[PDB]
Coordinates of C-alpha atoms and ligand atoms in Angstrom, one line a residue:
Chain A
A1 CA 138.2 60.6 100.9
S2 CA 135.5 59.8 103.1
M3 CA 134.7 62.0 106.4
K4 CA 132.0 61.7 108.9
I5 CA 129.9 64.9 109.3
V6 CA 127.5 65.3 112.1
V7 CA 125.0 67.9 112.1
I8 CA 123.9 69.1 115.5
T9 CA 120.7 71.0 115.7
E10 CA 118.4 71.0 118.6
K11 CA 116.5 73.4 116.2
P12 CA 116.5 71.5 112.9
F13 CA 116.9 72.9 109.2
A14 CA 114.1 72.9 106.8
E15 CA 114.1 69.8 104.5
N16 CA 115.4 71.7 101.6
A17 CA 118.6 72.5 103.6
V18 CA 119.1 69.2 104.9
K19 CA 118.9 68.1 101.2
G20 CA 121.5 70.8 100.2
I21 CA 123.7 69.8 102.9
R22 CA 123.4 66.1 101.8
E23 CA 124.0 66.9 98.0
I24 CA 127.2 69.0 98.7
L25 CA 128.8 66.5 100.9
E26 CA 127.6 63.1 99.6
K27 CA 128.5 64.0 96.1
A28 CA 132.0 64.4 97.5
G29 CA 132.0 61.2 99.1
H30 CA 131.0 61.9 102.8
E31 CA 128.9 60.4 105.4
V32 CA 126.0 63.0 106.8
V33 CA 124.5 62.0 110.1
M34 CA 121.7 64.2 111.8
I35 CA 121.2 65.0 115.5
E36 CA 117.9 66.6 115.6
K37 CA 115.5 67.6 118.3
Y38 CA 117.9 66.0 120.9
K39 CA 116.9 66.4 124.7
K40 CA 120.0 65.7 126.7
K41 CA 123.7 66.7 125.5
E42 CA 124.6 63.0 126.3
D43 CA 123.0 62.4 123.1
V44 CA 125.4 64.6 121.5
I45 CA 128.4 63.4 123.3
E46 CA 128.0 59.7 121.9
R47 CA 127.5 60.5 118.2
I48 CA 130.3 63.1 117.9
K49 CA 133.0 60.9 119.0
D50 CA 133.6 59.3 115.6
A51 CA 132.9 62.7 113.7
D52 CA 135.6 64.3 111.4
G53 CA 133.6 67.4 110.9
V54 CA 130.6 69.1 112.6
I55 CA 127.8 71.7 111.4
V56 CA 126.0 73.5 114.3
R57 CA 123.5 76.3 114.7
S58 CA 122.7 77.9 118.1
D59 CA 123.8 74.7 119.9
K60 CA 125.7 74.9 122.9
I61 CA 129.1 73.4 122.3
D62 CA 131.2 73.1 125.2
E63 CA 134.3 71.6 126.6
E64 CA 133.0 67.9 127.5
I65 CA 131.4 68.0 123.8
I66 CA 134.6 69.3 122.3
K67 CA 136.9 66.7 124.2
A68 CA 134.5 63.8 123.5
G69 CA 134.9 65.0 119.7
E70 CA 138.4 63.7 119.7
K71 CA 138.9 63.3 116.0
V72 CA 136.9 66.3 115.1
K73 CA 139.0 68.5 112.9
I74 CA 136.3 71.2 112.0
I75 CA 133.3 72.9 113.4
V76 CA 130.9 75.2 111.1
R77 CA 128.2 77.2 112.6
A78 CA 125.5 77.7 110.1
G79 CA 125.1 81.5 110.7
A80 CA 126.8 84.4 112.4
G81 CA 127.3 84.4 116.0
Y82 CA 129.7 81.6 117.7
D83 CA 129.2 82.5 121.6
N84 CA 127.5 79.1 121.9
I85 CA 131.0 77.4 121.0
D86 CA 133.9 77.2 123.5
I87 CA 136.7 78.7 121.2
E88 CA 139.4 78.3 124.3
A89 CA 138.4 74.4 124.3
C90 CA 138.7 74.2 120.8
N91 CA 141.9 75.6 120.6
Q92 CA 143.1 73.0 122.8
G93 CA 141.8 70.1 120.5
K94 CA 143.4 71.8 117.7
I95 CA 139.7 72.4 116.0
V96 CA 138.9 74.8 113.3
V97 CA 135.9 76.8 114.1
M98 CA 134.2 79.1 111.3
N99 CA 130.8 80.6 110.7
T100 CA 129.0 81.4 107.5
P101 CA 128.8 85.3 107.6
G102 CA 125.8 87.1 106.0
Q103 CA 123.9 83.8 105.0
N104 CA 121.0 84.5 107.8
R105 CA 121.1 88.3 107.1
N106 CA 117.9 88.7 105.2
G107 CA 115.7 86.6 107.6
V108 CA 116.7 88.4 110.4
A109 CA 116.5 91.8 109.0
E110 CA 113.1 91.3 107.6
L111 CA 111.9 90.3 110.9
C112 CA 113.6 93.3 112.5
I113 CA 111.7 95.7 110.2
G114 CA 108.5 93.7 110.8
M115 CA 108.8 93.9 114.5
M116 CA 109.5 97.5 114.1
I117 CA 106.1 98.2 112.4
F118 CA 104.5 95.6 114.8
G119 CA 106.0 97.5 117.9
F120 CA 105.0 101.1 116.7
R121 CA 101.5 100.0 115.6
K122 CA 100.6 98.6 119.2
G123 CA 101.0 95.0 118.2
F124 CA 98.3 95.4 115.6
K125 CA 95.8 96.1 118.4
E126 CA 93.7 99.2 118.8
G127 CA 95.3 102.6 119.7
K128 CA 97.0 105.5 118.1
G129 CA 100.1 104.1 116.4
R130 CA 103.1 105.7 114.7
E131 CA 104.9 105.6 111.5
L132 CA 108.5 104.5 111.1
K133 CA 108.9 107.3 107.9
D134 CA 110.7 110.5 108.9
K135 CA 111.9 109.0 112.2
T136 CA 115.7 108.4 113.3
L137 CA 116.9 104.9 113.4
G138 CA 120.2 104.0 115.5
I139 CA 121.9 100.7 114.4
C140 CA 123.9 99.4 117.2
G141 CA 126.6 97.3 115.4
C142 CA 126.8 97.5 111.6
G143 CA 127.6 94.1 110.0
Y144 CA 125.7 92.0 107.5
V145 CA 122.2 92.3 109.4
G146 CA 122.6 95.9 110.4
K147 CA 123.4 96.7 106.7
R148 CA 120.3 95.2 105.3
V149 CA 118.0 96.7 108.1
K150 CA 119.2 100.0 107.1
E151 CA 118.6 99.5 103.3
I152 CA 115.0 98.6 104.0
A153 CA 114.7 101.4 106.7
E154 CA 116.0 104.1 104.2
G155 CA 113.3 102.7 101.8
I156 CA 110.4 103.3 104.4
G157 CA 112.3 107.0 105.0
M158 CA 113.9 106.5 108.1
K159 CA 117.0 108.6 108.9
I160 CA 120.0 106.5 110.0
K161 CA 122.6 106.7 112.5
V162 CA 125.2 104.1 113.0
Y163 CA 127.5 102.9 116.1
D164 CA 130.1 100.5 115.6
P165 CA 133.4 100.8 117.3
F166 CA 135.3 98.4 114.9
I167 CA 134.2 99.9 111.4
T168 CA 134.2 103.5 109.5
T169 CA 131.0 104.4 107.9
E170 CA 128.6 107.4 107.0
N171 CA 126.5 109.1 109.9
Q172 CA 128.5 107.5 112.6
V173 CA 128.6 108.7 116.0
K174 CA 131.5 107.7 118.7
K175 CA 129.6 107.5 121.9
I176 CA 126.8 105.0 122.4
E177 CA 125.2 107.4 124.7
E178 CA 124.5 109.9 121.8
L179 CA 123.0 107.0 119.8
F180 CA 120.2 106.5 122.3
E181 CA 119.7 110.3 122.6
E182 CA 119.2 111.2 119.0
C183 CA 117.2 107.9 117.8
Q184 CA 113.7 107.2 118.2
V185 CA 114.4 103.5 117.3
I186 CA 117.1 101.4 118.2
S187 CA 118.1 98.0 116.5
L188 CA 120.5 96.0 118.3
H189 CA 123.1 93.9 116.0
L190 CA 125.6 93.3 118.4
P191 CA 127.6 90.0 118.7
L192 CA 127.7 88.6 122.4
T193 CA 131.3 89.2 123.8
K194 CA 132.5 89.8 127.5
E195 CA 132.4 93.5 126.3
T196 CA 128.8 93.6 125.1
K197 CA 127.4 91.5 127.8
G198 CA 124.9 93.5 129.7
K199 CA 125.9 96.7 127.8
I200 CA 122.6 97.8 127.2
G201 CA 121.1 99.1 130.5
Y202 CA 119.2 101.5 132.4
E203 CA 121.6 104.5 131.7
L204 CA 121.4 103.9 127.9
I205 CA 117.9 103.1 127.6
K206 CA 116.6 106.1 129.8
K207 CA 118.1 108.5 127.1
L208 CA 115.6 107.6 124.6
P209 CA 113.0 110.3 123.0
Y210 CA 109.1 109.9 123.5
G211 CA 108.0 106.3 122.5
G212 CA 111.5 105.3 122.1
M213 CA 111.7 101.8 120.8
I214 CA 114.4 99.0 121.1
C215 CA 114.5 96.1 118.6
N216 CA 116.8 93.1 119.7
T217 CA 117.1 90.5 116.9
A218 CA 120.8 90.0 118.2
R219 CA 121.1 88.3 121.7
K220 CA 119.3 88.6 124.9
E221 CA 122.4 88.8 127.1
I222 CA 123.5 92.0 125.6
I223 CA 120.7 93.4 127.6
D224 CA 120.7 94.2 131.0
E225 CA 117.1 92.8 132.1
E226 CA 117.2 94.5 135.6
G227 CA 118.0 97.9 134.0
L228 CA 115.2 97.6 131.2
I229 CA 112.6 96.6 133.8
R230 CA 113.6 99.5 136.0
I231 CA 113.3 102.2 133.0
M232 CA 110.2 100.7 131.6
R233 CA 108.5 100.9 134.9
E234 CA 109.6 104.5 135.2
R235 CA 108.7 105.5 131.4
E236 CA 105.5 103.8 130.3
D237 CA 106.1 105.0 126.8
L238 CA 109.1 102.9 126.0
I239 CA 108.7 100.1 123.6
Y240 CA 110.8 96.8 123.7
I241 CA 110.4 94.1 120.8
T242 CA 112.7 91.2 120.7
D243 CA 113.4 87.8 118.9
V244 CA 115.4 86.7 121.8
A245 CA 113.0 86.5 124.7
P246 CA 114.0 87.9 128.2
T247 CA 114.1 85.2 131.0
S248 CA 112.3 87.5 133.6
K249 CA 108.6 87.0 133.8
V250 CA 107.9 90.7 134.6
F251 CA 108.1 91.8 130.9
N252 CA 104.9 89.9 130.0
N253 CA 102.8 90.6 132.9
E254 CA 103.6 94.4 133.2
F255 CA 104.6 95.7 130.0
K256 CA 101.6 94.6 127.8
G257 CA 100.8 96.9 124.8
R258 CA 104.5 97.9 124.7
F259 CA 106.4 94.6 124.7
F260 CA 106.5 91.7 122.5
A261 CA 109.0 88.5 122.2
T262 CA 108.8 85.8 120.1
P263 CA 108.4 82.1 121.8
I264 CA 111.6 81.3 120.4
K265 CA 114.4 83.0 118.1
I266 CA 112.9 82.8 114.5
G267 CA 115.0 85.3 112.9
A268 CA 116.8 82.7 111.0
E269 CA 113.7 80.3 110.7
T270 CA 113.0 80.6 107.1
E271 CA 113.1 78.3 104.3
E272 CA 115.6 80.7 102.5
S273 CA 117.9 81.6 105.4
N274 CA 118.3 77.6 106.3
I275 CA 119.2 76.7 102.6
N276 CA 122.0 79.9 102.6
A277 CA 123.4 78.8 106.0
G278 CA 123.2 75.1 105.8
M279 CA 124.5 74.9 102.3
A280 CA 127.3 77.4 103.1
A281 CA 128.4 75.4 106.1
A282 CA 128.4 71.9 104.0
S283 CA 130.7 73.8 101.0
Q284 CA 133.1 75.0 103.7
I285 CA 133.6 71.7 105.3
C286 CA 133.9 70.4 101.7
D287 CA 136.6 73.1 101.0
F288 CA 138.3 72.3 104.4
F289 CA 139.0 68.4 103.6
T290 CA 139.6 69.0 100.1
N291 CA 142.0 71.8 99.9
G292 CA 142.7 72.6 103.6
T293 CA 140.8 75.9 103.1
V294 CA 140.3 77.9 106.4
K295 CA 138.5 80.9 105.0
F296 CA 136.0 82.5 107.7
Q297 CA 137.8 80.7 110.4
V298 CA 137.3 82.7 113.8
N299 CA 139.8 80.9 116.2
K300 CA 143.9 80.4 116.1
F301 CA 145.7 77.5 117.4
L302 CA 149.1 75.7 117.3
Chain B
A1 CA 80.2 134.5 107.4
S2 CA 80.7 132.1 110.4
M3 CA 80.1 128.6 109.4
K4 CA 79.3 125.4 111.9
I5 CA 81.6 122.8 110.8
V6 CA 80.7 119.4 112.9
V7 CA 83.4 116.7 113.0
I8 CA 81.8 113.3 113.1
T9 CA 84.2 110.7 114.2
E10 CA 83.1 107.5 116.2
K11 CA 86.9 106.4 116.7
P12 CA 88.3 110.0 117.1
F13 CA 91.4 111.8 115.5
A14 CA 94.5 112.1 117.4
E15 CA 94.5 115.2 119.8
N16 CA 97.0 117.2 117.5
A17 CA 94.8 116.7 114.5
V18 CA 91.6 118.0 116.2
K19 CA 94.1 121.1 117.4
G20 CA 95.2 121.4 113.6
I21 CA 91.4 121.4 112.5
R22 CA 90.7 124.1 114.9
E23 CA 93.7 126.1 113.9
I24 CA 92.4 126.4 110.4
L25 CA 88.8 126.7 111.0
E26 CA 88.7 129.2 114.0
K27 CA 91.2 131.6 112.4
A28 CA 89.0 131.8 109.4
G29 CA 86.1 132.5 112.0
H30 CA 84.4 129.3 111.8
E31 CA 82.8 127.2 114.5
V32 CA 84.2 123.4 115.2
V33 CA 81.7 121.2 116.9
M34 CA 83.3 117.7 117.8
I35 CA 80.6 114.6 117.6
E36 CA 83.2 112.0 119.1
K37 CA 82.4 108.3 120.3
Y38 CA 78.9 108.2 119.5
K39 CA 77.0 104.7 119.5
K40 CA 74.4 104.7 116.5
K41 CA 73.3 106.8 113.7
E42 CA 70.9 108.6 115.8
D43 CA 73.2 110.8 118.0
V44 CA 74.5 112.5 114.9
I45 CA 70.9 113.3 113.5
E46 CA 69.9 116.3 115.8
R47 CA 73.5 117.8 116.2
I48 CA 73.8 118.1 112.3
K49 CA 70.6 119.7 111.8
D50 CA 72.2 123.1 112.0
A51 CA 75.4 122.0 110.6
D52 CA 76.6 124.0 107.5
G53 CA 79.8 121.8 106.8
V54 CA 80.8 118.2 107.9
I55 CA 84.2 116.5 108.5
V56 CA 83.8 112.7 108.6
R57 CA 86.3 109.5 108.8
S58 CA 84.7 106.1 108.1
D59 CA 81.5 106.8 109.6
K60 CA 78.2 105.5 108.0
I61 CA 76.4 108.8 106.7
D62 CA 73.1 107.4 105.2
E63 CA 69.9 109.3 103.6
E64 CA 68.5 109.9 107.2
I65 CA 71.5 111.8 108.3
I66 CA 71.8 113.7 104.9
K67 CA 68.0 114.9 105.4
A68 CA 68.5 116.0 108.7
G69 CA 71.3 118.2 107.4
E70 CA 69.1 120.8 105.8
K71 CA 71.6 123.4 105.6
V72 CA 74.7 121.3 105.2
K73 CA 76.6 122.4 102.0
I74 CA 79.7 120.2 102.2
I75 CA 80.9 116.9 103.6
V76 CA 84.7 116.0 103.5
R77 CA 85.8 112.6 104.1
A78 CA 89.3 112.8 105.7
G79 CA 91.0 110.1 103.9
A80 CA 90.5 108.0 100.7
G81 CA 87.4 106.1 100.4
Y82 CA 83.8 107.3 100.5
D83 CA 81.6 104.2 100.2
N84 CA 80.4 105.2 103.8
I85 CA 78.6 108.3 102.2
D86 CA 75.4 107.9 100.2
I87 CA 76.3 110.0 97.4
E88 CA 73.0 109.6 95.6
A89 CA 71.3 111.3 98.5
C90 CA 73.9 113.9 98.9
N91 CA 73.2 114.9 95.2
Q92 CA 69.6 115.5 96.2
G93 CA 70.6 117.4 99.2
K94 CA 72.8 119.6 97.2
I95 CA 75.9 118.7 99.2
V96 CA 79.3 118.8 97.8
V97 CA 81.2 115.4 98.7
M98 CA 85.1 115.5 99.2
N99 CA 87.7 113.1 100.1
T100 CA 91.6 113.9 100.9
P101 CA 93.4 111.8 98.4
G102 CA 97.0 110.1 99.5
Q103 CA 96.9 112.0 103.0
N104 CA 96.9 108.9 105.0
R105 CA 98.6 106.8 102.4
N106 CA 101.7 105.9 104.6
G107 CA 99.9 104.8 107.7
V108 CA 98.2 102.0 105.4
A109 CA 101.3 101.4 103.3
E110 CA 103.5 100.6 106.3
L111 CA 100.8 98.6 108.1
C112 CA 100.5 96.7 104.9
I113 CA 104.3 96.0 104.9
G114 CA 104.4 95.0 108.4
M115 CA 101.1 92.7 107.8
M116 CA 103.0 91.0 104.9
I117 CA 105.9 90.2 107.3
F118 CA 103.8 89.3 109.9
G119 CA 102.0 86.8 107.7
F120 CA 104.9 85.2 106.1
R121 CA 106.5 84.6 109.6
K122 CA 103.6 82.6 111.1
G123 CA 102.4 85.5 113.1
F124 CA 105.9 85.8 114.9
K125 CA 105.3 82.4 116.4
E126 CA 107.4 79.1 116.2
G127 CA 107.7 77.6 112.7
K128 CA 109.4 77.9 109.2
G129 CA 108.6 81.1 107.6
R130 CA 109.3 82.7 104.2
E131 CA 111.1 85.7 103.2
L132 CA 109.7 88.5 101.0
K133 CA 112.9 89.3 99.2
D134 CA 112.9 87.6 95.7
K135 CA 109.0 86.9 95.9
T136 CA 106.7 88.7 93.2
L137 CA 104.3 91.1 94.9
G138 CA 101.0 91.8 93.0
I139 CA 99.6 95.3 93.8
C140 CA 95.7 95.2 93.1
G141 CA 94.9 99.1 92.6
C142 CA 98.1 101.1 92.3
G143 CA 97.2 104.5 93.6
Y144 CA 98.5 106.4 96.8
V145 CA 98.8 103.5 99.1
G146 CA 99.5 101.0 96.3
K147 CA 102.4 103.2 94.9
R148 CA 104.1 103.7 98.4
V149 CA 103.7 99.8 99.4
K150 CA 105.5 99.3 95.9
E151 CA 108.2 101.7 97.1
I152 CA 108.8 99.8 100.3
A153 CA 108.7 96.4 98.8
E154 CA 111.4 97.1 96.2
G155 CA 113.6 98.1 98.8
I156 CA 113.0 94.7 100.5
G157 CA 113.9 93.2 97.1
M158 CA 110.5 92.0 95.9
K159 CA 109.4 92.0 92.4
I160 CA 106.4 94.0 91.4
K161 CA 103.5 93.4 89.0
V162 CA 100.4 95.7 88.9
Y163 CA 96.9 95.4 87.9
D164 CA 95.0 98.8 87.8
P165 CA 92.8 99.6 84.4
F166 CA 92.9 103.3 85.2
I167 CA 96.6 104.0 85.0
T168 CA 99.7 102.9 82.8
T169 CA 102.7 101.6 84.5
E170 CA 105.6 99.2 83.8
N171 CA 105.2 95.4 84.7
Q172 CA 101.3 95.7 84.1
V173 CA 99.0 92.9 83.6
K174 CA 95.7 93.7 81.9
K175 CA 93.7 90.7 83.3
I176 CA 93.3 90.3 87.3
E177 CA 93.6 86.6 86.5
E178 CA 97.3 87.1 85.5
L179 CA 98.1 88.9 88.6
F180 CA 96.7 85.9 90.9
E181 CA 98.6 83.3 88.6
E182 CA 102.0 85.1 88.6
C183 CA 102.4 86.4 92.3
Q184 CA 103.3 84.9 95.5
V185 CA 102.0 87.7 97.4
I186 CA 98.8 90.0 96.6
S187 CA 97.9 93.5 98.1
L188 CA 94.4 94.9 97.7
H189 CA 94.3 98.4 97.3
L190 CA 90.8 98.8 95.6
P191 CA 87.9 101.3 96.4
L192 CA 84.6 99.7 97.2
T193 CA 82.4 100.4 94.1
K194 CA 79.7 98.7 92.3
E195 CA 82.3 96.8 90.2
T196 CA 84.4 95.8 93.1
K197 CA 82.1 94.5 95.7
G198 CA 82.5 90.6 95.9
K199 CA 85.1 90.7 93.1
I200 CA 87.9 88.7 95.0
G201 CA 86.5 85.3 95.1
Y202 CA 87.1 81.5 94.7
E203 CA 88.2 81.7 91.0
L204 CA 90.8 84.3 91.5
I205 CA 92.4 83.2 94.7
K206 CA 92.4 79.5 93.2
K207 CA 95.5 80.8 90.8
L208 CA 97.8 81.4 93.8
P209 CA 101.3 79.8 93.9
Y210 CA 102.2 77.6 97.1
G211 CA 101.7 79.3 100.1
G212 CA 100.1 82.5 98.3
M213 CA 99.4 85.4 100.6
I214 CA 96.8 87.9 100.3
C215 CA 96.8 91.2 102.2
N216 CA 93.8 93.4 102.6
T217 CA 94.0 96.8 103.9
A218 CA 91.4 98.2 101.7
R219 CA 87.8 97.1 102.1
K220 CA 86.2 93.8 103.6
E221 CA 83.3 93.8 101.0
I222 CA 85.7 93.2 98.1
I223 CA 86.2 90.0 99.2
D224 CA 83.7 87.3 98.3
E225 CA 83.9 85.6 101.9
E226 CA 82.1 82.4 100.9
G227 CA 84.4 82.1 97.9
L228 CA 87.6 82.8 100.2
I229 CA 86.4 80.2 103.0
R230 CA 86.1 77.7 100.3
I231 CA 89.6 77.8 98.5
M232 CA 91.1 78.1 102.1
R233 CA 89.6 75.0 103.0
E234 CA 90.8 73.3 99.7
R235 CA 94.2 74.9 100.0
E236 CA 95.5 75.0 103.5
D237 CA 98.8 76.6 102.3
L238 CA 96.9 79.9 101.6
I239 CA 97.3 82.8 103.9
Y240 CA 94.8 85.6 104.6
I241 CA 95.9 89.1 106.2
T242 CA 93.5 91.7 106.6
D243 CA 93.1 95.3 108.3
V244 CA 89.2 94.7 107.5
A245 CA 87.9 91.9 109.7
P246 CA 85.5 89.8 107.6
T247 CA 81.8 89.2 108.8
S248 CA 81.9 85.5 108.8
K249 CA 83.3 83.9 111.9
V250 CA 84.6 81.0 109.9
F251 CA 88.1 82.5 109.5
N252 CA 88.7 82.7 113.3
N253 CA 87.3 79.4 114.0
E254 CA 89.1 77.3 111.2
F255 CA 92.0 78.8 109.7
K256 CA 94.3 79.2 112.5
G257 CA 98.2 79.9 111.8
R258 CA 97.0 81.3 108.3
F259 CA 94.5 84.1 109.0
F260 CA 95.3 87.5 110.6
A261 CA 92.8 90.4 111.4
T262 CA 93.1 93.5 113.3
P263 CA 90.1 93.7 115.7
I264 CA 89.3 97.4 114.1
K265 CA 90.7 99.0 110.9
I266 CA 94.1 100.7 112.0
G267 CA 95.5 101.5 108.7
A268 CA 94.8 105.3 109.2
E269 CA 95.4 105.0 113.0
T270 CA 98.4 106.9 113.4
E271 CA 99.6 110.3 114.6
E272 CA 100.8 111.4 111.4
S273 CA 98.2 110.2 108.9
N274 CA 95.5 111.6 111.3
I275 CA 97.0 115.1 111.3
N276 CA 97.5 114.9 107.3
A277 CA 93.9 113.7 106.7
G278 CA 92.2 116.1 109.2
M279 CA 94.1 119.2 108.4
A280 CA 93.6 118.6 104.7
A281 CA 90.0 118.1 105.2
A282 CA 89.7 121.6 107.3
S283 CA 91.7 123.6 104.5
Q284 CA 89.4 122.1 101.9
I285 CA 86.3 123.0 103.8
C286 CA 87.9 126.6 104.6
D287 CA 88.6 127.0 100.6
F288 CA 85.1 125.9 99.6
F289 CA 83.4 128.5 102.0
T290 CA 86.2 131.2 101.1
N291 CA 86.5 130.7 97.4
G292 CA 84.1 127.8 96.5
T293 CA 86.9 125.9 95.3
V294 CA 85.6 122.2 94.5
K295 CA 89.1 120.4 93.8
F296 CA 88.6 116.7 95.3
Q297 CA 85.2 116.7 94.8
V298 CA 83.5 113.2 94.0
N299 CA 80.2 114.0 93.1
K300 CA 78.2 116.4 91.0
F301 CA 74.5 117.7 91.0
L302 CA 71.8 120.1 89.9
Ligands
NAD1 N1 92.5 100.5 106.0 C1 92.7 101.8 106.1 O1 92.8 102.4 107.0 C2 92.6 102.4 104.6 C3 92.9 103.9 104.5 C4 92.8 104.4 103.2 C5 92.3 103.7 102.0 N2 91.7 102.4 102.4 C6 91.1 101.6 101.2 O2 92.2 101.3 100.5 C7 91.8 102.0 99.1 C8 93.0 102.7 98.6 O3 93.4 104.0 99.0 P1 94.1 105.0 98.0 O4 94.5 106.1 98.8 O5 95.4 104.2 97.3 O6 92.9 105.3 96.9 P2 93.4 105.6 95.4 O7 92.3 106.3 94.7 O8 94.7 106.6 95.4 O9 93.8 104.5 94.9 C9 93.0 103.1 94.3 C10 93.2 102.5 93.0 O10 92.6 101.5 92.8 C11 92.3 101.6 91.4 N3 91.1 101.0 91.0 C12 89.8 101.5 91.1 N4 88.9 100.9 90.4 C13 89.5 99.7 90.2 C14 88.9 98.4 89.8 N5 87.8 98.2 89.5 N6 90.0 97.4 89.7 C15 91.2 97.5 89.8 N7 91.6 98.8 90.2 C16 91.0 99.7 90.4 C17 92.2 103.1 91.0 O11 93.0 103.4 89.7 C18 93.1 103.7 91.9 O12 94.5 104.0 91.6 C19 90.7 103.1 99.3 O13 89.9 103.3 98.4 C20 90.2 102.4 100.6 O14 89.1 101.9 100.4 C21 91.8 101.7 103.6

């Protein structure tokens, strides 16, 4: 009846999201312990050994953590992506891994739109800016976020083209090359896999029309940083804006006036998105222990 | 008859807008004289002395400039507001004064939406932001810009309430007090008149809900600066974003994290808006000297 639920967040939820988490789980007679703003993963290893269930954000969950959590039955990522979790090692420990699809979608999409206007208007500094209206937007991967970005972009009056090798939808091109050729603005929403890693590089970015802008609210490592640096040095009209800051120091030093990155990923860092993702994670934990519910599971074992 | 048209723009139009102005005016057989990037309202005086028509942006057009333009028959403001022009003295000089309604509406509206997101997301810095979706937006003055903002905000999923005595629309309040009580976000789209000068002050801004935000892409003089300073010192949750930077230095010094201003007014600083505003101004001057049409005239004399 009573399960130990550990919440691992180096980047903590807003108070109201923690309260919601506690309200769902404690009413069902569970214990909730928080691990917030931890420095070393040694802190995590200790507090997890006794945990029955886990709630996580973007926190790296690797083999060493997974094995230390010997009685862990479920890990729920409050959000969409699960590249931070070692699925293979979770399969070994017979641990159910799930996410919370679409819960952060509006936070990320609103930031994506805001970044598009910000990038097209020279970072709100002096100079001749451009308007998003009557321009073509390319959505790279169209799931929950890409869908919302599209909705707002149509209200603004942008023409929409979509690339996604896994779905069938309107205005869809089959080649990712065509998207970069046809679209004045690219928004990336691809999850990080072995296939999408370093996929967006020099050969794709170069094909952009005049004043081409890439907005990245997805993952930094789907970009080939070397290729981006190379084309941005060659073409001084290109704009790159991102919620997932690049590692290289080049971008800040060389591309002022056409490059912006947030100091940290703030796409899901809103009061509302924290509540959605935090409470959805707690409810799925609740359902799993109550009814053996494994909806939204991403892995397979035994 | 070949007329001399002078274009007075301290911050110049985009080149394509200048080209579009010349295409309309030189085909009709008129002369176009550019007065770009001057420093004081004294460079204009001698060059306007033999001007027949004038195109102007936000540039200050006082009695001294009007009296010097003794053969000026028409002044067209490429844009919306005409508080920069001394109408009284124009009436005495028997000069027709026009603006170009709605031409730069999208440049401003897009910037306004971008500023709202920017402001609700801690200027794209680290912190807990808020989402515009599901919040109520108060449009203060619902003309060309106001209406276009409404349109975009509706796609974002904001609820809309309107204060504007000159129009009839749904979800409308009759007291400006009501707008500030009921709306989390306020957006100013009022012209600067006798009535609107210093209207938005302490007593109105008081009534905003928690984390109330005001976006001002209109005019700086509609704000009672000392009143705004007072309420913002009192209420640290309040946010003020503006395209029309205030006179007082207090805002930069004290309200870090909840105050954001552009270094210069950039609402109409786009390729697209320059083209629309400039070419309409040229067509309106052309029609005035061709057929004497006075549509869009904002004054009357004799
Ligand atoms: N930042 C920029 O670059 C930029 C660009 C364009 C306009 N502006 C400013 O924003 C204003 C709006 O532009 P617009 O094209 O929508 O003008 P507009 O005339 O189309 O709309 C202004 C609206 O304000 C309403 N209004 C007038 N007096 C009012 C009062 N006393 N109280 C409440 N509402 C009142 C009018 O009914 C009108 O609908 C302009 O007047 C100008 O001052 C700024």
